Amino acid sequence: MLDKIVIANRGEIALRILRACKELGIKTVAVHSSADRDLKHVLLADETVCIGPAPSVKSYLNIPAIISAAEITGAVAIHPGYGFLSENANFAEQVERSGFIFIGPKAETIRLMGDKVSAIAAMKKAGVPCVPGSDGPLGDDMDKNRAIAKRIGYPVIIKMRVVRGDAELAQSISMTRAYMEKYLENPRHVEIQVLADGQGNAIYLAERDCSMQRRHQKVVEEAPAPGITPELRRYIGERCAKACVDIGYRGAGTFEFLFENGEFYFIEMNTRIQVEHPVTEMITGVDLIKEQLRIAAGQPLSIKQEEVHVRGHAVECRINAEDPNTFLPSPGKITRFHAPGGFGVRWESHIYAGYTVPPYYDSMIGKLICYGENRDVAIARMKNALQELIIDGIKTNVDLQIRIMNDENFQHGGTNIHYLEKKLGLQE
Amino acid sequence: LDKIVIANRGEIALRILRACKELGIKTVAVHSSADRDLKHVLLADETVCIGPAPSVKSYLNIPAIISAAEITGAVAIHPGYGFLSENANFAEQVERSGFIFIGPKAETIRLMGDKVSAIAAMKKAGVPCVPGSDGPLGDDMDKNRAIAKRIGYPVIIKASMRVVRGDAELAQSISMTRAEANDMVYMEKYLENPRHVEIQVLADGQGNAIYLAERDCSMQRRHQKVVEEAPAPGITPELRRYIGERCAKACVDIGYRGAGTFEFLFENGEFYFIEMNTRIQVEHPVTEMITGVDLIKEQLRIAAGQPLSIKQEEVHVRGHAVECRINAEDPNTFLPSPGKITRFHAPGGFGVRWESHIYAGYTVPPYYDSMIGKLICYGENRDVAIARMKNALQELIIDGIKTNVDLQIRIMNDENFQHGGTNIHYLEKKLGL
C-alpha cells in the first residue's frame, strides 16, 4: 500500500477519494486553490497545501505547483480525479518522470486515446465496433458509391445531408460538395466500465446508460442499461476487455458507445474515473476507487470476471447549482441543507450548510444515488429522496430531476439521447 | 393498504414513512404537541396532534390513537418499536375497533409476553432453552449430582451469590440455599460468558416463515444495546441453519404473524433462548444490508395479506454490517441530554446508511428516550464495515448537545471488538461499570 497520496482535485470527487484513502489507511494531502480553503475534504485531510489562487489555470491546472506539493509532503502518488489534468499526458509523464506514481494509465495510453484518429484505428485493430462509413472520401462513380451505401445500411449521412434510399443519393451528394457515414437517428448512450492491472489482466463491470443529456452533458445515469441482455453484455464487455490488453491499459477506464438496434458504435474512451461510477459500485459491489489505488500500488487485479455479478438496479441524479429555467450557474451561500437518508440511498457531496459555492468552477455540487432490487424500486426511492433534500440559498436543478423521475417515458425506460432536450424544448 | 397511521415518533417513524411512500401507502402521522417538528411529521400526508408532550398522554394514549385512525379513514396502524408495540390490550383494541394491527395477533403477544408461557412454548417447538432441574430439587444427592452432570457445570442453585463449579460444593450449596429460603430450590445451567445472538424471522400468518440470519448484540451497557452487527462472527452456515429452522418452526407452531426476533444467549457453540420480541427491532437495518430485504416493506405486505415473497432458498448472506446507535445523553448518568442542535452534518459514502430524523435547528425534547440516530456501515467483510464506521463517525457533526459519538469511536477502536466475539460483559468491564 501507498503510504500517502496527493488528491489533485476538488469538490465531490475529492471527498470520494479521501474516504477511499482513509479506509485503506493511506495518508492524504489535499491541494487547494485559495478559494477552496473551506472544502469539506480539505477539512478532513491529513495535510493540505494551497497551490494557488482561485482560477484553475492558476491552481488546479498548475502542474509545477502540484508536483511540488507532492515532493514537499513526501507523497508517493497523485490521484487526478476526473476533469482537470486527469486526461493530460504531459501531466502524467511529468508525474512519473518526477518520481511519483500517477493514479491512471500511462501517458502514452492517454495520448493514444486522446487522439480521435489513433483511437478508432486502435479500436478497429482491437476488434471494437466503430461507426461504419465510406472508408475514405467518395467520387463520381455513383454506380460505385451506391454500392457502399448499401453495405453501410440506410440511413446514411453524407458529410451534412442525410439519405434514406438510392433515389436521393445523387442530388444529395451533388448539393453536398456545394465522406459517407452510417446514420444513427435514435441512439442510446451506453458505456462500459473496465479495470485493467497493466499486468495483463482486465475485466469489465457491466454497463451504464447515460442517455439523459443536455448540451451533451449527462444529467441522469443508470446501471445496468435497460434492454441489454447478458449475451450482449458479454459480447461487448469481452471486446472492451480485450482492447485493454491490446493497448496495455492500466487502471479504470470507460468505453462509450452509441447503441442502436442491438448494435454498439464506439464513440470514445475515457481514460480515467467518471462522475457516474457510483451506479456501477451499487450493482456490482466493487469499490472502484479502491481498485484504482490497489492497481497503483502494483497489485494485481483482485477480481475475476466470473466473480463480477450484477444485482439490482441503481439510478443517479446529478445535483447542480444552476437556474433550472436559464441554466445559468447559481453560485452562492447555502443557507439551509438537509441530506436525504434511508435504505438504498447514497449521497455523494461536499456541500454543507453555510458553505459557499464559488463561481470559478463547475456547477455540480452533489450526486444522489438510489438502489433497489429493480428499476421501479430504485426510481421510487429516488423520488422520495429528492423530496427530502433541502438546499436553500441558491438555485438548483432538483425540480427538474424530480420531473424526470416522474416522466412516463423515463419510467418505461429506453429514452434516447435526444429526449431530454426535446422534453425541455431545447431543440430550437 | 391504502393509508396507515404511524403510531410512533423519531427515527423509526421516519423509517416507516419512507417504506409507505415507496409502496404508495398514504401516511397519517400522530404526534404529541412537542413533536410538531419531527422530520416525519413534516413529510406526512396527514397529521394529527394526539395530546400534550408526555407519552402517557400522547403516545401511550390508546383512545387518542384509535380516533386519529377513524377520522382519517386509515386501514391499519403501525406501532413501530417500544411504546404500545407489544401491548396486547392495544393490539386487541385496534382490531376490535376495525383496524389492522401491523404486528402479530394479541394472543401471540400475550403468550410470548409471559416468560413462563413463552419458555413453555419454545420447549415444545424444539427451541433450545436454558437447561435446569425442571422442578424442585429433592434430598437425594446421587440424583442431584446426576442432574448437575446432565446440565454441565457450572450451575447455579436457585430458590423458588454462589456458583457451583463441581460436585464437591453441590450438596453444601443446595442445603445452604434452602437454609436461607416456598423453601424448595432448583438448579439451572450457569452461563458465565455468553454472547447475545438473535434470530430475525418473518411469518405471513399463513403457514410460511423464514429466518434471516442473525445479529450479534453483545456490546451493551447496563443491559442496553450500543452496537449491533450481522452476521454474528463465528456462526457457521450449519449452526445458522440449525437455529434458524428451529425458529421458523416455532413460528408456525404458535401461528406467528409479522416480523419478530428470537433472542438467545450463545456460549460454547450452544444457543439458549432468552426471549422473543414480537415486533420490529431498533437494529433491523444491519439485517437488511446483508440480506438485501426491506423488512419494513415486508411487514406491510404481510399486513396487506400477502404471503411471503421470499423463500428461504432465496435468502443470502452477503457482506457484513455494523450499526452504532447515536444518543443524546449524559455521559455519566446516560440520561437524555436535551436541547438545540446548532450545527449538523451527516456522513455519506459507499456502504454508509444514516437513519435519523434530526436536523440543524432541531430541538431534542427532554420527554422521551435519548436515541437520535443510527449509523450503519456495510462492507464486503467485517473489517471493511469497521473501517467505514470509523470514518463515518469522524465526519458526523452534531453540535449543541452531548452525544455518545466519542464512546462509539472508542469502541470501534477497541482491539477486542476488532478481533470480534466479545461477550456481554465486555463493554462495562472496559468502561469500568
JSON list of N, CA and C in Angstrom, two decimals, chain A residues 294-330:
[
{"chain": "A", "resi": 294, "resn": "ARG", "atom": "N", "xyz": [-5.33, 0.15, -5.54]},
{"chain": "A", "resi": 294, "resn": "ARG", "atom": "CA", "xyz": [-4.59, -1.09, -5.48]},
{"chain": "A", "resi": 294, "resn": "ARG", "atom": "C", "xyz": [-3.74, -1.31, -6.71]},
{"chain": "A", "resi": 295, "resn": "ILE", "atom": "N", "xyz": [-4.33, -1.08, -7.88]},
{"chain": "A", "resi": 295, "resn": "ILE", "atom": "CA", "xyz": [-3.62, -1.30, -9.11]},
{"chain": "A", "resi": 295, "resn": "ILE", "atom": "C", "xyz": [-2.39, -0.43, -9.10]},
{"chain": "A", "resi": 296, "resn": "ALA", "atom": "N", "xyz": [-2.54, 0.80, -8.56]},
{"chain": "A", "resi": 296, "resn": "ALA", "atom": "CA", "xyz": [-1.44, 1.78, -8.46]},
{"chain": "A", "resi": 296, "resn": "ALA", "atom": "C", "xyz": [-0.25, 1.31, -7.58]},
{"chain": "A", "resi": 297, "resn": "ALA", "atom": "N", "xyz": [-0.58, 0.60, -6.49]},
{"chain": "A", "resi": 297, "resn": "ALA", "atom": "CA", "xyz": [0.32, 0.03, -5.52]},
{"chain": "A", "resi": 297, "resn": "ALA", "atom": "C", "xyz": [1.03, -1.21, -6.05]},
{"chain": "A", "resi": 298, "resn": "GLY", "atom": "N", "xyz": [0.80, -1.50, -7.34]},
{"chain": "A", "resi": 298, "resn": "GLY", "atom": "CA", "xyz": [1.41, -2.60, -8.08]},
{"chain": "A", "resi": 298, "resn": "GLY", "atom": "C", "xyz": [0.68, -3.91, -7.93]},
{"chain": "A", "resi": 299, "resn": "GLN", "atom": "N", "xyz": [-0.44, -3.88, -7.23]},
{"chain": "A", "resi": 299, "resn": "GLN", "atom": "CA", "xyz": [-1.19, -5.11, -7.05]},
{"chain": "A", "resi": 299, "resn": "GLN", "atom": "C", "xyz": [-1.94, -5.57, -8.25]},
{"chain": "A", "resi": 300, "resn": "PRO", "atom": "N", "xyz": [-2.00, -6.88, -8.36]},
{"chain": "A", "resi": 300, "resn": "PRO", "atom": "CA", "xyz": [-2.67, -7.46, -9.47]},
{"chain": "A", "resi": 300, "resn": "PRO", "atom": "C", "xyz": [-4.17, -7.30, -9.28]},
{"chain": "A", "resi": 301, "resn": "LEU", "atom": "N", "xyz": [-4.92, -7.61, -10.34]},
{"chain": "A", "resi": 301, "resn": "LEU", "atom": "CA", "xyz": [-6.38, -7.50, -10.28]},
{"chain": "A", "resi": 301, "resn": "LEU", "atom": "C", "xyz": [-6.91, -8.54, -9.31]},
{"chain": "A", "resi": 302, "resn": "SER", "atom": "N", "xyz": [-7.55, -8.08, -8.26]},
{"chain": "A", "resi": 302, "resn": "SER", "atom": "CA", "xyz": [-8.11, -8.95, -7.22]},
{"chain": "A", "resi": 302, "resn": "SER", "atom": "C", "xyz": [-9.36, -9.72, -7.63]},
{"chain": "A", "resi": 303, "resn": "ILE", "atom": "N", "xyz": [-10.07, -9.19, -8.59]},
{"chain": "A", "resi": 303, "resn": "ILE", "atom": "CA", "xyz": [-11.32, -9.74, -9.05]},
{"chain": "A", "resi": 303, "resn": "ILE", "atom": "C", "xyz": [-11.24, -10.45, -10.37]},
{"chain": "A", "resi": 304, "resn": "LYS", "atom": "N", "xyz": [-11.96, -11.56, -10.42]},
{"chain": "A", "resi": 304, "resn": "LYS", "atom": "CA", "xyz": [-12.05, -12.36, -11.62]},
{"chain": "A", "resi": 304, "resn": "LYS", "atom": "C", "xyz": [-13.41, -12.11, -12.24]},
{"chain": "A", "resi": 305, "resn": "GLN", "atom": "N", "xyz": [-13.38, -12.03, -13.57]},
{"chain": "A", "resi": 305, "resn": "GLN", "atom": "CA", "xyz": [-14.60, -11.73, -14.28]},
{"chain": "A", "resi": 305, "resn": "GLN", "atom": "C", "xyz": [-15.82, -12.51, -13.84]},
{"chain": "A", "resi": 306, "resn": "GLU", "atom": "N", "xyz": [-15.60, -13.80, -13.67]},
{"chain": "A", "resi": 306, "resn": "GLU", "atom": "CA", "xyz": [-16.66, -14.72, -13.31]},
{"chain": "A", "resi": 306, "resn": "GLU", "atom": "C", "xyz": [-17.19, -14.41, -11.95]},
{"chain": "A", "resi": 307, "resn": "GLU", "atom": "N", "xyz": [-16.45, -13.56, -11.26]},
{"chain": "A", "resi": 307, "resn": "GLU", "atom": "CA", "xyz": [-16.86, -13.11, -9.94]},
{"chain": "A", "resi": 307, "resn": "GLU", "atom": "C", "xyz": [-17.69, -11.82, -10.00]},
{"chain": "A", "resi": 308, "resn": "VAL", "atom": "N", "xyz": [-17.74, -11.20, -11.16]},
{"chain": "A", "resi": 308, "resn": "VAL", "atom": "CA", "xyz": [-18.50, -9.97, -11.38]},
{"chain": "A", "resi": 308, "resn": "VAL", "atom": "C", "xyz": [-19.98, -10.32, -11.65]},
{"chain": "A", "resi": 309, "resn": "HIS", "atom": "N", "xyz": [-20.85, -9.89, -10.71]},
{"chain": "A", "resi": 309, "resn": "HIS", "atom": "CA", "xyz": [-22.30, -10.13, -10.73]},
{"chain": "A", "resi": 309, "resn": "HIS", "atom": "C", "xyz": [-23.11, -8.89, -10.55]},
{"chain": "A", "resi": 310, "resn": "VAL", "atom": "N", "xyz": [-24.01, -8.76, -11.47]},
{"chain": "A", "resi": 310, "resn": "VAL", "atom": "CA", "xyz": [-24.87, -7.62, -11.47]},
{"chain": "A", "resi": 310, "resn": "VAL", "atom": "C", "xyz": [-26.12, -7.92, -10.70]},
{"chain": "A", "resi": 311, "resn": "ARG", "atom": "N", "xyz": [-26.36, -7.12, -9.69]},
{"chain": "A", "resi": 311, "resn": "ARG", "atom": "CA", "xyz": [-27.59, -7.31, -8.94]},
{"chain": "A", "resi": 311, "resn": "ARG", "atom": "C", "xyz": [-28.27, -5.98, -8.65]},
{"chain": "A", "resi": 312, "resn": "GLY", "atom": "N", "xyz": [-29.57, -6.00, -8.84]},
{"chain": "A", "resi": 312, "resn": "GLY", "atom": "CA", "xyz": [-30.44, -4.87, -8.59]},
{"chain": "A", "resi": 312, "resn": "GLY", "atom": "C", "xyz": [-30.28, -3.81, -9.66]},
{"chain": "A", "resi": 313, "resn": "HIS", "atom": "N", "xyz": [-30.70, -2.61, -9.33]},
{"chain": "A", "resi": 313, "resn": "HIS", "atom": "CA", "xyz": [-30.65, -1.53, -10.28]},
{"chain": "A", "resi": 313, "resn": "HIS", "atom": "C", "xyz": [-30.31, -0.24, -9.51]},
{"chain": "A", "resi": 314, "resn": "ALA", "atom": "N", "xyz": [-29.53, 0.63, -10.12]},
{"chain": "A", "resi": 314, "resn": "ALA", "atom": "CA", "xyz": [-29.18, 1.90, -9.45]},
{"chain": "A", "resi": 314, "resn": "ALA", "atom": "C", "xyz": [-29.36, 3.09, -10.39]},
{"chain": "A", "resi": 315, "resn": "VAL", "atom": "N", "xyz": [-29.81, 4.25, -9.84]},
{"chain": "A", "resi": 315, "resn": "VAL", "atom": "CA", "xyz": [-30.03, 5.46, -10.63]},
{"chain": "A", "resi": 315, "resn": "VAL", "atom": "C", "xyz": [-29.29, 6.61, -10.00]},
{"chain": "A", "resi": 316, "resn": "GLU", "atom": "N", "xyz": [-28.75, 7.49, -10.85]},
{"chain": "A", "resi": 316, "resn": "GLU", "atom": "CA", "xyz": [-28.06, 8.66, -10.35]},
{"chain": "A", "resi": 316, "resn": "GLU", "atom": "C", "xyz": [-28.57, 9.96, -10.93]},
{"chain": "A", "resi": 317, "resn": "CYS", "atom": "N", "xyz": [-28.84, 10.88, -10.03]},
{"chain": "A", "resi": 317, "resn": "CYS", "atom": "CA", "xyz": [-29.22, 12.22, -10.40]},
{"chain": "A", "resi": 317, "resn": "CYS", "atom": "C", "xyz": [-28.14, 13.19, -9.92]},
{"chain": "A", "resi": 318, "resn": "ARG", "atom": "N", "xyz": [-27.60, 13.93, -10.88]},
{"chain": "A", "resi": 318, "resn": "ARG", "atom": "CA", "xyz": [-26.63, 14.98, -10.62]},
{"chain": "A", "resi": 318, "resn": "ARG", "atom": "C", "xyz": [-27.35, 16.24, -10.09]},
{"chain": "A", "resi": 319, "resn": "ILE", "atom": "N", "xyz": [-26.81, 16.79, -9.02]},
{"chain": "A", "resi": 319, "resn": "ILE", "atom": "CA", "xyz": [-27.35, 17.99, -8.43]},
{"chain": "A", "resi": 319, "resn": "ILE", "atom": "C", "xyz": [-26.40, 19.17, -8.72]},
{"chain": "A", "resi": 320, "resn": "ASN", "atom": "N", "xyz": [-26.94, 20.15, -9.44]},
{"chain": "A", "resi": 320, "resn": "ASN", "atom": "CA", "xyz": [-26.19, 21.32, -9.89]},
{"chain": "A", "resi": 320, "resn": "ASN", "atom": "C", "xyz": [-26.80, 22.61, -9.36]},
{"chain": "A", "resi": 321, "resn": "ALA", "atom": "N", "xyz": [-25.90, 23.55, -9.05]},
{"chain": "A", "resi": 321, "resn": "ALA", "atom": "CA", "xyz": [-26.30, 24.89, -8.61]},
{"chain": "A", "resi": 321, "resn": "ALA", "atom": "C", "xyz": [-26.53, 25.71, -9.87]},
{"chain": "A", "resi": 322, "resn": "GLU", "atom": "N", "xyz": [-27.71, 25.68, -10.41]},
{"chain": "A", "resi": 322, "resn": "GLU", "atom": "CA", "xyz": [-27.94, 26.42, -11.62]},
{"chain": "A", "resi": 322, "resn": "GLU", "atom": "C", "xyz": [-29.39, 26.69, -11.68]},
{"chain": "A", "resi": 323, "resn": "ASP", "atom": "N", "xyz": [-29.68, 27.74, -12.39]},
{"chain": "A", "resi": 323, "resn": "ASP", "atom": "CA", "xyz": [-31.05, 28.13, -12.57]},
{"chain": "A", "resi": 323, "resn": "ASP", "atom": "C", "xyz": [-31.71, 27.16, -13.52]},
{"chain": "A", "resi": 324, "resn": "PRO", "atom": "N", "xyz": [-32.69, 26.44, -13.02]},
{"chain": "A", "resi": 324, "resn": "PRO", "atom": "CA", "xyz": [-33.38, 25.45, -13.79]},
{"chain": "A", "resi": 324, "resn": "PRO", "atom": "C", "xyz": [-34.06, 25.95, -15.05]},
{"chain": "A", "resi": 325, "resn": "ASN", "atom": "N", "xyz": [-34.42, 27.28, -15.16]},
{"chain": "A", "resi": 325, "resn": "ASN", "atom": "CA", "xyz": [-35.04, 27.78, -16.38]},
{"chain": "A", "resi": 325, "resn": "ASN", "atom": "C", "xyz": [-34.09, 28.49, -17.40]},
{"chain": "A", "resi": 326, "resn": "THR", "atom": "N", "xyz": [-32.98, 29.02, -16.91]},
{"chain": "A", "resi": 326, "resn": "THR", "atom": "CA", "xyz": [-31.97, 29.70, -17.72]},
{"chain": "A", "resi": 326, "resn": "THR", "atom": "C", "xyz": [-30.79, 28.76, -17.90]},
{"chain": "A", "resi": 327, "resn": "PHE", "atom": "N", "xyz": [-30.58, 27.96, -16.87]},
{"chain": "A", "resi": 327, "resn": "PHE", "atom": "CA", "xyz": [-29.50, 27.01, -16.86]},
{"chain": "A", "resi": 327, "resn": "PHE", "atom": "C", "xyz": [-28.18, 27.69, -16.63]},
{"chain": "A", "resi": 328, "resn": "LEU", "atom": "N", "xyz": [-28.30, 28.88, -16.02]},
{"chain": "A", "resi": 328, "resn": "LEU", "atom": "CA", "xyz": [-27.17, 29.76, -15.70]},
{"chain": "A", "resi": 328, "resn": "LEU", "atom": "C", "xyz": [-26.65, 29.34, -14.33]},
{"chain": "A", "resi": 329, "resn": "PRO", "atom": "N", "xyz": [-25.30, 29.26, -14.14]},
{"chain": "A", "resi": 329, "resn": "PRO", "atom": "CA", "xyz": [-24.73, 28.86, -12.86]},
{"chain": "A", "resi": 329, "resn": "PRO", "atom": "C", "xyz": [-25.39, 29.62, -11.73]},
{"chain": "A", "resi": 330, "resn": "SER", "atom": "N", "xyz": [-25.38, 29.07, -10.55]},
{"chain": "A", "resi": 330, "resn": "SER", "atom": "CA", "xyz": [-26.03, 29.80, -9.48]},
{"chain": "A", "resi": 330, "resn": "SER", "atom": "C", "xyz": [-25.18, 29.76, -8.25]}
]
